[PDB]
Amino acid sequence: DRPRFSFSIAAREGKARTGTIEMKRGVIRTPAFMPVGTAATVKALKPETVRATGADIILGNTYHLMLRPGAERIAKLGGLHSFMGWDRPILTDSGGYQVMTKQSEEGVTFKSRHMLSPERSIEIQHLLGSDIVMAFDECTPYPATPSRAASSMERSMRWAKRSRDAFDSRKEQAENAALFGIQQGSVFENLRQQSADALAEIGFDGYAVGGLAVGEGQDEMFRVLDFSVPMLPDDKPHYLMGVGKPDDIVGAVERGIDMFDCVLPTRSGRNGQAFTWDGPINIRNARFSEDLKPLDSECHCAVCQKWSRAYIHHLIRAGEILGAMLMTEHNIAFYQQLMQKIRDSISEGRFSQFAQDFRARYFA
Amino acid sequence: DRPRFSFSIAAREGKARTGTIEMKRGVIRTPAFMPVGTAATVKALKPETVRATGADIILGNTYHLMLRPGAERIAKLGGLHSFMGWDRPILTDSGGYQVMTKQSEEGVTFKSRHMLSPERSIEIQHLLGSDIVMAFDECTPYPATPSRAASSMERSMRWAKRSRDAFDSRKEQAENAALFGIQQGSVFENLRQQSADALAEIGFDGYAVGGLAVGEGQDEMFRVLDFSVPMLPDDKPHYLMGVGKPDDIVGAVERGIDMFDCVLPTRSGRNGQAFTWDGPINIRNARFSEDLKPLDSECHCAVCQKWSRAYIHHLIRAGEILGAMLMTEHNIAFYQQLMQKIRDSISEGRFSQFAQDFRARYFA
Ligand SMILES: O=c1[nH]c(=O)c2nn[nH]c2[nH]1
Ligand SMILES: O=c1[nH]c(=O)c2nn[nH]c2[nH]1
Ligand SMILES: [Zn+2]
Ligand SMILES: [Zn+2]
């Protein structure tokens, strides 16, 4: 049968890498973008359509699903894959970051009231049946004092060890799924180093850079990535959580990131924002009312093969569900085409040229 | 090339008929159900999905489209078919009934203010490019005195003649589209007869029974159909406007109706009502939370091949767009499967048995 988790780097250019993760439910091409499910659905898209855009893996929202329908119910119904009709890999967040409430060394309590711990988070992700399980971590406020960022990071590292142990104690989970650790430490180099050291001493299948979708700005995000990603084991995937805009993704790949997730293409699609190679546009704008061109005249997606800006403009202005469907399909397809161009350009040793050409046009 | 409008009856059983309408953009199998578009979209469905359910023709909403985007704009963009991506026949209502405001012999004025006349309605439907054009008629209140029903019907008949003349004066329209007249007369037999006589003296490609989606109850609707449908030319299609529930459709076919439209499968789908051969169910009900059966265990639609009641229950409770998509696809598919069973049973001389079996199970 297929491997549980096998990461292979096919090509490099500078700090950028391209390759594959082989898992039992399929292959993930990296750098990868994971569409975000909100409540066991990628908003407005059937799973076949998600796959048709090129997605290899989706993110399942543990925070939402643990309350309704609940993890035990989803397990009774056959697991999240069967429930939502997506048979390929699913990555689940741990839930602790989202819900952040009172915390302690045991875990986090939240509002009627509920308690999440590393052990309960691993069990919930087990019941959901996800393929990549995230360690249970804390949300560090931004800005944070060095001392508060330190205490938060060190609690997260103790929770990472407990996540590792709980995962390993469930033999079906350990045999069939993968476990990722999450680096914290806010914007402070020495804390990011201590966090990386702790995670590597525990050992994980992949390493996420956490705590950088906190509104700090791209310059500062890139600064932190500059010193943080090289601290992580080179031979394991690097996952930048909650990022981001297309230009964020390009710059983060240039700094060694292999995996991404963000609600932007789905959320902003329903709200009228379409991503294009010439930058984002708001299809609700009256300037599109008679525009017969597709959302993007170089996009390969099914929406751009069949419908005009003028039609989609009309649908969104009218509040029509089909408007949200077409905008979301195009935006996820655009993100997947971006990742494909990234992967191809690294494989061909032309990623620096691509990144320069991309930015010149996207921000023209 | 293909015929403009050719209606053929293949088989009869009692007053029920089954056959085909051949038009330039395709064949319509009768008895037919037309999904209703709201604003150049069948809510929550791509045109390919509408076709996949079995639909041969859809209804376009003239009232909505004449305001936004406007008929002239849709024509500038290539017509309604190109605009929404549906290349098969479209029937458009005339708009007068919907908007009903002040009226006169010229037409109707409504709120900023606008005026619709028979000539303007035909022109709007021409600009949209529809295949079946409806004569411009009046909305009769229900209940109505005989005298008010008479004056309304006779104004509608004068408007039907003006609709005929305006249609015939546009040679591209007359060569490529069809024109249906609308019988009025409220619940009064003598007025229904005078209306039928007037429409037949003008001559139309098809004849609608208007004014029976006014809340009168099924018993009274069937009573009016009993004497009204035989007044219409036998050799032309009979269209019952705005009807209806599955049991309404079966009984109306038994009384000689060939065509139907209703917002029920789309509207009630988004609101949690699913049609099944055992009657309607509300998928939001907690009793479906762990039900792994499809919406209907005999339905052939793609939703029922892939997803459970429990999943769709979750989606609708969560407010998710995919919930509306799956409910609407199933409900339109159910309606199309109902029409297919009707057509097959008439063709096979088993429609009386079907109707009896249908009602026993649907209302068990
Ligand atoms: O967007 C984010 N999601 C998470 O689950 C997370 N965990 N740490 N940082 C995070 N950022
Ligand atoms: O539902 C209806 N729609 C119409 O357009 C119409 N016209 N007459 N009766 C009608 N009923
Ligand atoms: Zn596109
Ligand atoms: Zn179905």
Side-chain angles (χ1 to χ4, degrees), chain B residues 146-147 149-177:
Chain B
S147 286
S151 308
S152 178
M153 176 276 291
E154 288 288 0
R155 178 159 287 166
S156 286
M157 297 307 93
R158 296 190 293 273
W159 287 355
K161 170 57 176 168
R162 284 167 59 189
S163 298
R164 175 87 258 178
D165 289 347
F167 180 96
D168 289 340
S169 70
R170 295 154 164 80
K171 304 302 162 41
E172 184 278 334
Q173 186 170 36
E175 290 176 1
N176 288 291

PDB file of all heavy atoms in Angstrom, chain B residues 146-177, unseen atoms left out:
ATOM      1  N   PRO B 146     -67.624  38.647 -10.586  1.00  0.00           N
ATOM      2  CA  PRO B 146     -67.712  38.325 -12.010  1.00  0.00           C
ATOM      3  C   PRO B 146     -67.444  39.532 -12.887  1.00  0.00           C
ATOM      4  O   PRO B 146     -66.751  39.398 -13.900  1.00  0.00           O
ATOM      5  CB  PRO B 146     -69.144  37.797 -12.152  1.00  0.00           C
ATOM      6  CG  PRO B 146     -69.463  37.240 -10.791  1.00  0.00           C
ATOM      7  CD  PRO B 146     -68.746  38.095  -9.807  1.00  0.00           C
ATOM      8  N   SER B 147     -67.954  40.714 -12.512  1.00  0.00           N
ATOM      9  CA  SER B 147     -67.787  41.892 -13.365  1.00  0.00           C
ATOM     10  C   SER B 147     -66.335  42.338 -13.420  1.00  0.00           C
ATOM     11  O   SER B 147     -65.841  42.718 -14.490  1.00  0.00           O
ATOM     12  CB  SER B 147     -68.678  43.041 -12.884  1.00  0.00           C
ATOM     13  OG  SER B 147     -70.022  42.776 -13.205  1.00  0.00           O
ATOM     14  N   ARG B 148     -65.623  42.284 -12.289  1.00  0.00           N
ATOM     15  CA  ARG B 148     -64.215  42.671 -12.296  1.00  0.00           C
ATOM     16  C   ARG B 148     -63.363  41.620 -12.997  1.00  0.00           C
ATOM     17  O   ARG B 148     -62.396  41.958 -13.683  1.00  0.00           O
ATOM     18  CB  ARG B 148     -63.727  42.900 -10.864  1.00  0.00           C
ATOM     19  CG  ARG B 148     -64.455  44.028 -10.133  1.00  0.00           C
ATOM     20  CD  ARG B 148     -64.099  45.382 -10.698  1.00  0.00           C
ATOM     21  N   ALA B 149     -63.693  40.339 -12.827  1.00  0.00           N
ATOM     22  CA  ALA B 149     -62.978  39.301 -13.558  1.00  0.00           C
ATOM     23  C   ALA B 149     -63.219  39.439 -15.057  1.00  0.00           C
ATOM     24  O   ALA B 149     -62.308  39.213 -15.869  1.00  0.00           O
ATOM     25  CB  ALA B 149     -63.406  37.922 -13.058  1.00  0.00           C
ATOM     26  N   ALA B 150     -64.430  39.852 -15.438  1.00  0.00           N
ATOM     27  CA  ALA B 150     -64.754  40.034 -16.856  1.00  0.00           C
ATOM     28  C   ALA B 150     -63.968  41.185 -17.471  1.00  0.00           C
ATOM     29  O   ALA B 150     -63.365  41.036 -18.540  1.00  0.00           O
ATOM     30  CB  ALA B 150     -66.261  40.269 -17.027  1.00  0.00           C
ATOM     31  N   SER B 151     -63.969  42.350 -16.814  1.00  0.00           N
ATOM     32  CA  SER B 151     -63.256  43.498 -17.365  1.00  0.00           C
ATOM     33  C   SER B 151     -61.761  43.233 -17.438  1.00  0.00           C
ATOM     34  O   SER B 151     -61.103  43.608 -18.413  1.00  0.00           O
ATOM     35  CB  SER B 151     -63.545  44.737 -16.522  1.00  0.00           C
ATOM     36  OG  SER B 151     -64.939  44.900 -16.386  1.00  0.00           O
ATOM     37  N   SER B 152     -61.205  42.569 -16.420  1.00  0.00           N
ATOM     38  CA  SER B 152     -59.787  42.229 -16.441  1.00  0.00           C
ATOM     39  C   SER B 152     -59.475  41.267 -17.581  1.00  0.00           C
ATOM     40  O   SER B 152     -58.540  41.487 -18.362  1.00  0.00           O
ATOM     41  CB  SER B 152     -59.383  41.620 -15.102  1.00  0.00           C
ATOM     42  OG  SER B 152     -58.021  41.224 -15.101  1.00  0.00           O
ATOM     43  N   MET B 153     -60.268  40.201 -17.705  1.00  0.00           N
ATOM     44  CA  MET B 153     -60.057  39.249 -18.790  1.00  0.00           C
ATOM     45  C   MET B 153     -60.157  39.931 -20.148  1.00  0.00           C
ATOM     46  O   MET B 153     -59.352  39.656 -21.042  1.00  0.00           O
ATOM     47  CB  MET B 153     -61.062  38.097 -18.674  1.00  0.00           C
ATOM     48  CG  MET B 153     -61.026  37.061 -19.804  1.00  0.00           C
ATOM     49  SD  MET B 153     -61.987  37.521 -21.267  1.00  0.00           S
ATOM     50  CE  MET B 153     -63.642  37.394 -20.615  1.00  0.00           C
ATOM     51  N   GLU B 154     -61.130  40.819 -20.340  1.00  0.00           N
ATOM     52  CA  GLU B 154     -61.280  41.398 -21.673  1.00  0.00           C
ATOM     53  C   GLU B 154     -60.158  42.375 -21.995  1.00  0.00           C
ATOM     54  O   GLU B 154     -59.730  42.451 -23.155  1.00  0.00           O
ATOM     55  CB  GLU B 154     -62.643  42.071 -21.812  1.00  0.00           C
ATOM     56  CG  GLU B 154     -63.816  41.075 -21.911  1.00  0.00           C
ATOM     57  CD  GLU B 154     -63.874  40.322 -23.242  1.00  0.00           C
ATOM     58  OE1 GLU B 154     -63.008  40.551 -24.114  1.00  0.00           O
ATOM     59  OE2 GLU B 154     -64.796  39.492 -23.411  1.00  0.00           O
ATOM     60  N   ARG B 155     -59.649  43.112 -21.002  1.00  0.00           N
ATOM     61  CA  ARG B 155     -58.444  43.908 -21.240  1.00  0.00           C
ATOM     62  C   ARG B 155     -57.264  43.006 -21.578  1.00  0.00           C
ATOM     63  O   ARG B 155     -56.498  43.298 -22.498  1.00  0.00           O
ATOM     64  CB  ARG B 155     -58.115  44.775 -20.028  1.00  0.00           C
ATOM     65  CG  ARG B 155     -56.825  45.582 -20.216  1.00  0.00           C
ATOM     66  CD  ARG B 155     -56.745  46.781 -19.295  1.00  0.00           C
ATOM     67  NE  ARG B 155     -57.664  47.837 -19.707  1.00  0.00           N
ATOM     68  CZ  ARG B 155     -57.994  48.865 -18.939  1.00  0.00           C
ATOM     69  NH1 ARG B 155     -57.493  48.963 -17.707  1.00  0.00           N
ATOM     70  NH2 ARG B 155     -58.842  49.778 -19.386  1.00  0.00           N
ATOM     71  N   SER B 156     -57.121  41.878 -20.867  1.00  0.00           N
ATOM     72  CA  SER B 156     -56.056  40.940 -21.201  1.00  0.00           C
ATOM     73  C   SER B 156     -56.200  40.417 -22.627  1.00  0.00           C
ATOM     74  O   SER B 156     -55.197  40.167 -23.304  1.00  0.00           O
ATOM     75  CB  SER B 156     -56.039  39.784 -20.210  1.00  0.00           C
ATOM     76  OG  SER B 156     -55.506  40.188 -18.961  1.00  0.00           O
ATOM     77  N   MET B 157     -57.429  40.207 -23.100  1.00  0.00           N
ATOM     78  CA  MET B 157     -57.581  39.695 -24.459  1.00  0.00           C
ATOM     79  C   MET B 157     -57.217  40.761 -25.489  1.00  0.00           C
ATOM     80  O   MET B 157     -56.609  40.449 -26.521  1.00  0.00           O
ATOM     81  CB  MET B 157     -59.004  39.164 -24.692  1.00  0.00           C
ATOM     82  CG  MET B 157     -59.397  37.964 -23.815  1.00  0.00           C
ATOM     83  SD  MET B 157     -58.267  36.552 -23.863  1.00  0.00           S
ATOM     84  CE  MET B 157     -57.181  36.909 -22.486  1.00  0.00           C
ATOM     85  N   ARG B 158     -57.571  42.024 -25.237  1.00  0.00           N
ATOM     86  CA  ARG B 158     -57.119  43.086 -26.132  1.00  0.00           C
ATOM     87  C   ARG B 158     -55.602  43.196 -26.111  1.00  0.00           C
ATOM     88  O   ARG B 158     -54.972  43.404 -27.156  1.00  0.00           O
ATOM     89  CB  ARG B 158     -57.760  44.409 -25.744  1.00  0.00           C
ATOM     90  CG  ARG B 158     -59.264  44.378 -25.911  1.00  0.00           C
ATOM     91  CD  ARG B 158     -59.855  45.745 -25.763  1.00  0.00           C
ATOM     92  NE  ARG B 158     -59.720  46.279 -24.411  1.00  0.00           N
ATOM     93  CZ  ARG B 158     -60.587  46.072 -23.426  1.00  0.00           C
ATOM     94  NH1 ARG B 158     -61.660  45.305 -23.616  1.00  0.00           N
ATOM     95  NH2 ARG B 158     -60.376  46.631 -22.243  1.00  0.00           N
ATOM     96  N   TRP B 159     -55.003  43.070 -24.924  1.00  0.00           N
ATOM     97  CA  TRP B 159     -53.551  43.045 -24.823  1.00  0.00           C
ATOM     98  C   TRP B 159     -52.944  41.837 -25.522  1.00  0.00           C
ATOM     99  O   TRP B 159     -51.833  41.937 -26.052  1.00  0.00           O
ATOM    100  CB  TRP B 159     -53.125  43.077 -23.359  1.00  0.00           C
ATOM    101  CG  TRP B 159     -53.315  44.406 -22.690  1.00  0.00           C
ATOM    102  CD1 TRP B 159     -53.723  45.573 -23.270  1.00  0.00           C
ATOM    103  CD2 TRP B 159     -53.058  44.717 -21.314  1.00  0.00           C
ATOM    104  NE1 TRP B 159     -53.742  46.591 -22.339  1.00  0.00           N
ATOM    105  CE2 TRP B 159     -53.346  46.088 -21.130  1.00  0.00           C
ATOM    106  CE3 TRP B 159     -52.625  43.963 -20.211  1.00  0.00           C
ATOM    107  CZ2 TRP B 159     -53.201  46.723 -19.891  1.00  0.00           C
ATOM    108  CZ3 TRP B 159     -52.498  44.593 -18.988  1.00  0.00           C
ATOM    109  CH2 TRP B 159     -52.787  45.959 -18.838  1.00  0.00           C
ATOM    110  N   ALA B 160     -53.648  40.694 -25.550  1.00  0.00           N
ATOM    111  CA  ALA B 160     -53.136  39.526 -26.259  1.00  0.00           C
ATOM    112  C   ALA B 160     -53.055  39.786 -27.756  1.00  0.00           C
ATOM    113  O   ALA B 160     -52.082  39.384 -28.412  1.00  0.00           O
ATOM    114  CB  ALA B 160     -54.023  38.304 -25.991  1.00  0.00           C
ATOM    115  N   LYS B 161     -54.058  40.481 -28.308  1.00  0.00           N
ATOM    116  CA  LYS B 161     -54.028  40.822 -29.725  1.00  0.00           C
ATOM    117  C   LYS B 161     -52.879  41.782 -30.016  1.00  0.00           C
ATOM    118  O   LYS B 161     -52.161  41.622 -31.012  1.00  0.00           O
ATOM    119  CB  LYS B 161     -55.385  41.413 -30.148  1.00  0.00           C
ATOM    120  CG  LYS B 161     -55.412  42.016 -31.528  1.00  0.00           C
ATOM    121  CD  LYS B 161     -55.012  41.064 -32.617  1.00  0.00           C
ATOM    122  CE  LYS B 161     -55.187  41.783 -33.959  1.00  0.00           C
ATOM    123  NZ  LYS B 161     -54.563  41.080 -35.125  1.00  0.00           N
ATOM    124  N   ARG B 162     -52.668  42.770 -29.144  1.00  0.00           N
ATOM    125  CA  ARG B 162     -51.552  43.688 -29.335  1.00  0.00           C
ATOM    126  C   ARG B 162     -50.216  42.971 -29.208  1.00  0.00           C
ATOM    127  O   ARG B 162     -49.261  43.304 -29.921  1.00  0.00           O
ATOM    128  CB  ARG B 162     -51.647  44.828 -28.332  1.00  0.00           C
ATOM    129  CG  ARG B 162     -52.722  45.842 -28.718  1.00  0.00           C
ATOM    130  CD  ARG B 162     -53.032  46.807 -27.580  1.00  0.00           C
ATOM    131  NE  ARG B 162     -51.876  47.582 -27.129  1.00  0.00           N
ATOM    132  CZ  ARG B 162     -51.874  48.348 -26.041  1.00  0.00           C
ATOM    133  NH1 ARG B 162     -52.958  48.459 -25.296  1.00  0.00           N
ATOM    134  NH2 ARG B 162     -50.790  49.017 -25.701  1.00  0.00           N
ATOM    135  N   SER B 163     -50.132  41.978 -28.308  1.00  0.00           N
ATOM    136  CA  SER B 163     -48.923  41.162 -28.184  1.00  0.00           C
ATOM    137  C   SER B 163     -48.656  40.376 -29.460  1.00  0.00           C
ATOM    138  O   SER B 163     -47.524  40.346 -29.967  1.00  0.00           O
ATOM    139  CB  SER B 163     -49.056  40.198 -26.994  1.00  0.00           C
ATOM    140  OG  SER B 163     -49.193  40.884 -25.761  1.00  0.00           O
ATOM    141  N   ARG B 164     -49.700  39.746 -30.002  1.00  0.00           N
ATOM    142  CA  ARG B 164     -49.600  39.044 -31.277  1.00  0.00           C
ATOM    143  C   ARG B 164     -49.071  39.964 -32.377  1.00  0.00           C
ATOM    144  O   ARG B 164     -48.168  39.593 -33.135  1.00  0.00           O
ATOM    145  CB  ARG B 164     -50.983  38.488 -31.639  1.00  0.00           C
ATOM    146  CG  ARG B 164     -51.096  37.821 -32.999  1.00  0.00           C
ATOM    147  CD  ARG B 164     -50.715  36.363 -32.918  1.00  0.00           C
ATOM    148  NE  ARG B 164     -49.376  36.129 -33.415  1.00  0.00           N
ATOM    149  CZ  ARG B 164     -48.768  34.946 -33.429  1.00  0.00           C
ATOM    150  NH1 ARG B 164     -49.345  33.866 -32.919  1.00  0.00           N
ATOM    151  NH2 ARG B 164     -47.558  34.849 -33.951  1.00  0.00           N
ATOM    152  N   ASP B 165     -49.634  41.166 -32.488  1.00  0.00           N
ATOM    153  CA  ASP B 165     -49.242  42.074 -33.567  1.00  0.00           C
ATOM    154  C   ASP B 165     -47.809  42.563 -33.395  1.00  0.00           C
ATOM    155  O   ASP B 165     -47.048  42.654 -34.369  1.00  0.00           O
ATOM    156  CB  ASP B 165     -50.181  43.271 -33.603  1.00  0.00           C
ATOM    157  CG  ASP B 165     -51.557  42.915 -34.101  1.00  0.00           C
ATOM    158  OD1 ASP B 165     -51.732  41.801 -34.660  1.00  0.00           O
ATOM    159  OD2 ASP B 165     -52.461  43.765 -33.941  1.00  0.00           O
ATOM    160  N   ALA B 166     -47.419  42.883 -32.162  1.00  0.00           N
ATOM    161  CA  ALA B 166     -46.061  43.358 -31.933  1.00  0.00           C
ATOM    162  C   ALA B 166     -45.040  42.258 -32.207  1.00  0.00           C
ATOM    163  O   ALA B 166     -43.981  42.512 -32.789  1.00  0.00           O
ATOM    164  CB  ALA B 166     -45.942  43.875 -30.503  1.00  0.00           C
ATOM    165  N   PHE B 167     -45.345  41.032 -31.792  1.00  0.00           N
ATOM    166  CA  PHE B 167     -44.495  39.880 -32.084  1.00  0.00           C
ATOM    167  C   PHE B 167     -44.342  39.678 -33.595  1.00  0.00           C
ATOM    168  O   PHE B 167     -43.232  39.489 -34.118  1.00  0.00           O
ATOM    169  CB  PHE B 167     -45.131  38.663 -31.404  1.00  0.00           C
ATOM    170  CG  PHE B 167     -44.399  37.356 -31.591  1.00  0.00           C
ATOM    171  CD1 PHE B 167     -43.494  36.889 -30.637  1.00  0.00           C
ATOM    172  CD2 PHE B 167     -44.695  36.544 -32.682  1.00  0.00           C
ATOM    173  CE1 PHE B 167     -42.876  35.664 -30.790  1.00  0.00           C
ATOM    174  CE2 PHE B 167     -44.087  35.313 -32.849  1.00  0.00           C
ATOM    175  CZ  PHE B 167     -43.168  34.867 -31.896  1.00  0.00           C
ATOM    176  N   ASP B 168     -45.457  39.709 -34.316  1.00  0.00           N
ATOM    177  CA  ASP B 168     -45.417  39.460 -35.755  1.00  0.00           C
ATOM    178  C   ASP B 168     -44.707  40.563 -36.534  1.00  0.00           C
ATOM    179  O   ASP B 168     -44.226  40.306 -37.643  1.00  0.00           O
ATOM    180  CB  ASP B 168     -46.832  39.296 -36.283  1.00  0.00           C
ATOM    181  CG  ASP B 168     -47.488  37.995 -35.837  1.00  0.00           C
ATOM    182  OD1 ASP B 168     -46.763  37.064 -35.444  1.00  0.00           O
ATOM    183  OD2 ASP B 168     -48.731  37.893 -35.912  1.00  0.00           O
ATOM    184  N   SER B 169     -44.618  41.768 -35.980  1.00  0.00           N
ATOM    185  CA  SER B 169     -43.997  42.879 -36.686  1.00  0.00           C
ATOM    186  C   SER B 169     -42.473  42.838 -36.639  1.00  0.00           C
ATOM    187  O   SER B 169     -41.825  43.622 -37.350  1.00  0.00           O
ATOM    188  CB  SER B 169     -44.490  44.198 -36.097  1.00  0.00           C
ATOM    189  OG  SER B 169     -43.974  44.390 -34.794  1.00  0.00           O
ATOM    190  N   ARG B 170     -41.898  41.965 -35.812  1.00  0.00           N
ATOM    191  CA  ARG B 170     -40.458  41.819 -35.665  1.00  0.00           C
ATOM    192  C   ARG B 170     -40.100  40.494 -36.318  1.00  0.00           C
ATOM    193  O   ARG B 170     -40.284  39.432 -35.717  1.00  0.00           O
ATOM    194  CB  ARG B 170     -40.068  41.862 -34.190  1.00  0.00           C
ATOM    195  CG  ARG B 170     -40.352  43.238 -33.527  1.00  0.00           C
ATOM    196  CD  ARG B 170     -40.570  43.114 -31.982  1.00  0.00           C
ATOM    197  NE  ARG B 170     -40.458  44.430 -31.355  1.00  0.00           N
ATOM    198  CZ  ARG B 170     -41.421  45.335 -31.342  1.00  0.00           C
ATOM    199  NH1 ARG B 170     -42.603  45.069 -31.906  1.00  0.00           N
ATOM    200  NH2 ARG B 170     -41.185  46.524 -30.809  1.00  0.00           N
ATOM    201  N   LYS B 171     -39.626  40.553 -37.561  1.00  0.00           N
ATOM    202  CA  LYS B 171     -39.556  39.336 -38.358  1.00  0.00           C
ATOM    203  C   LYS B 171     -38.551  38.340 -37.781  1.00  0.00           C
ATOM    204  O   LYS B 171     -38.803  37.134 -37.815  1.00  0.00           O
ATOM    205  CB  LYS B 171     -39.259  39.681 -39.824  1.00  0.00           C
ATOM    206  CG  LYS B 171     -40.301  40.662 -40.408  1.00  0.00           C
ATOM    207  CD  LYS B 171     -41.757  40.119 -40.342  1.00  0.00           C
ATOM    208  CE  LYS B 171     -42.797  41.238 -40.514  1.00  0.00           C
ATOM    209  NZ  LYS B 171     -42.403  42.219 -41.571  1.00  0.00           N
ATOM    210  N   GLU B 172     -37.431  38.808 -37.203  1.00  0.00           N
ATOM    211  CA  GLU B 172     -36.496  37.859 -36.580  1.00  0.00           C
ATOM    212  C   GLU B 172     -37.159  37.129 -35.424  1.00  0.00           C
ATOM    213  O   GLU B 172     -36.923  35.926 -35.208  1.00  0.00           O
ATOM    214  CB  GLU B 172     -35.223  38.563 -36.078  1.00  0.00           C
ATOM    215  CG  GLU B 172     -34.137  37.607 -35.480  1.00  0.00           C
ATOM    216  CD  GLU B 172     -34.387  37.203 -34.030  1.00  0.00           C
ATOM    217  OE1 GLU B 172     -35.052  37.962 -33.304  1.00  0.00           O
ATOM    218  OE2 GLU B 172     -33.909  36.124 -33.596  1.00  0.00           O
ATOM    219  N   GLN B 173     -37.982  37.839 -34.658  1.00  0.00           N
ATOM    220  CA  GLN B 173     -38.658  37.214 -33.529  1.00  0.00           C
ATOM    221  C   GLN B 173     -39.685  36.208 -34.025  1.00  0.00           C
ATOM    222  O   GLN B 173     -39.720  35.058 -33.562  1.00  0.00           O
ATOM    223  CB  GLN B 173     -39.303  38.283 -32.648  1.00  0.00           C
ATOM    224  CG  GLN B 173     -39.907  37.721 -31.359  1.00  0.00           C
ATOM    225  CD  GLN B 173     -40.326  38.806 -30.389  1.00  0.00           C
ATOM    226  OE1 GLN B 173     -40.802  39.858 -30.797  1.00  0.00           O
ATOM    227  NE2 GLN B 173     -40.130  38.562 -29.094  1.00  0.00           N
ATOM    228  N   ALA B 174     -40.499  36.611 -35.007  1.00  0.00           N
ATOM    229  CA  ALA B 174     -41.549  35.734 -35.514  1.00  0.00           C
ATOM    230  C   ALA B 174     -40.982  34.495 -36.189  1.00  0.00           C
ATOM    231  O   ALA B 174     -41.623  33.437 -36.173  1.00  0.00           O
ATOM    232  CB  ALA B 174     -42.444  36.485 -36.502  1.00  0.00           C
ATOM    233  N   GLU B 175     -39.792  34.595 -36.773  1.00  0.00           N
ATOM    234  CA  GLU B 175     -39.180  33.452 -37.448  1.00  0.00           C
ATOM    235  C   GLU B 175     -38.504  32.473 -36.489  1.00  0.00           C
ATOM    236  O   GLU B 175     -38.372  31.288 -36.818  1.00  0.00           O
ATOM    237  CB  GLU B 175     -38.170  33.957 -38.477  1.00  0.00           C
ATOM    238  CG  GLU B 175     -38.840  34.627 -39.630  1.00  0.00           C
ATOM    239  CD  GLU B 175     -37.855  35.213 -40.619  1.00  0.00           C
ATOM    240  OE1 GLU B 175     -36.623  35.085 -40.406  1.00  0.00           O
ATOM    241  OE2 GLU B 175     -38.319  35.810 -41.614  1.00  0.00           O
ATOM    242  N   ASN B 176     -38.087  32.925 -35.310  1.00  0.00           N
ATOM    243  CA  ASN B 176     -37.225  32.126 -34.443  1.00  0.00           C
ATOM    244  C   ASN B 176     -37.837  31.759 -33.105  1.00  0.00           C
ATOM    245  O   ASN B 176     -37.339  30.824 -32.454  1.00  0.00           O
ATOM    246  CB  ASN B 176     -35.902  32.863 -34.196  1.00  0.00           C
ATOM    247  CG  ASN B 176     -35.033  32.859 -35.413  1.00  0.00           C
ATOM    248  OD1 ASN B 176     -34.524  31.820 -35.807  1.00  0.00           O
ATOM    249  ND2 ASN B 176     -34.902  34.007 -36.057  1.00  0.00           N
ATOM    250  N   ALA B 177     -38.881  32.460 -32.673  1.00  0.00           N
ATOM    251  CA  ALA B 177     -39.508  32.253 -31.384  1.00  0.00           C
ATOM    252  C   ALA B 177     -40.967  31.867 -31.576  1.00  0.00           C
ATOM    253  O   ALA B 177     -41.498  31.845 -32.697  1.00  0.00           O
ATOM    254  CB  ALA B 177     -39.395  33.523 -30.519  1.00  0.00           C
TER     255      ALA B 177
END
